[PDB]
Structure 1
């Protein structure tokens, strides 16, 4: 729906940018699902590590603005947080924020994240990739033992 409705965002003056969050326990299939969705859309993942010390706010903004086309931004363990909190917030949703980009975030400790980062404008969709459930167990068994 987001990818198809391109002009609809512009006609109503919204930034054509969306962000997804997949929070859950470890080994729940989060990053695997990121890989699979990127493959399904034929997009290229642009992994980014914010805990990188040499990273700076200007470098961050340039990187998120000069991404290769047909790509998905990935921020594994966004709860880890030279980058600044305000700089990150403005980069995700702000004047310097880019356009026509999809970003995916993952955590095991969503409680650490504040309210501003979890704003709908920055994290539009949030999903709980929880532990295994009987449906998941059954379907995994069929996958491995058809």
Structure 2
């Protein structure tokens, strides 16, 4: 599929930047997990009314 830009899914201000900073911190810091014996996994939960963009945003993210 052609990459849907992240600016197309338009959510509230500050909501996209906090998730980008947290997940970019996870990809750019792989040493913080394994060194401490923690399973190298990250959990995320998005909840809200139907059709708000939970599955839409993940397509562009």
Give the TM bin, normalised by the shorter chain: 0.5 to 0.7
Alignment of 1:1-146 (within 5 A): 1-37=25-61
What do you get for the CA RMSD once the two structures are aligned? 0.8
User: Displaced runs of 4+ in structure 1, greater than 3 A?
Assistant: none
Distance 1:4 1:13 in 2: 18
For 1:29 and 1:3, how far apart are their aligned partners in 2?
A: 23
Choose 1 or 2 for highest CA Rg. 1
What's the offset of the Cα at 1:33? Answer: 0.4
| Count of residues paired in the alignment | 37
**Cα distance between partner residues in 2 of 1:24 and 1:30:** 8
Gaps of 5+ in 1: 38-146
- The CA distance in 2 between the partners of 1:8 and 1:20, in whole Å, is 18
Which structure has more relative contact order (CA 8 Å, sep 6+)? It is: 2
